[PDB]
Design a protein around this ligand. Sequence first.
Ligand SMILES: [Zn+2]
Ligand SMILES: [Zn+2]
Lengths: 56, 56
Amino acid sequence: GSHMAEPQRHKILCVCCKCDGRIELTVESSAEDLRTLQQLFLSTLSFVCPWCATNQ
Amino acid sequence: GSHMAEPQRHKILCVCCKCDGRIELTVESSAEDLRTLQQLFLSTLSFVCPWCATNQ
Ligand SMILES: [Zn+2]
Ligand SMILES: [Zn+2]
């Protein structure tokens, strides 16, 4: 049916640094705050999926 | 890099916006780059774990 949505729930489809697995990073982050944090990715940051992080 | 155990693989314990549940955000960047993104979280930002992100 219909529902609301808002420019928050956004999706940086990235990869995991330790396992090169695809990660859907749903980060609930305003588009240019997402952009900003994606500049932090482009600087240094990677994500490490909670599966692989738990397995280590 | 070379060697291992580099000061990036870090953990912003936050909560899911909609599960209202503990997400240990395993995000891999230097402490103050982590911190900067944590200031985004302290401003406005949330995380939406791949479980709820998939299920909505
Ligand atoms: Zn991973
Ligand atoms: Zn959640």
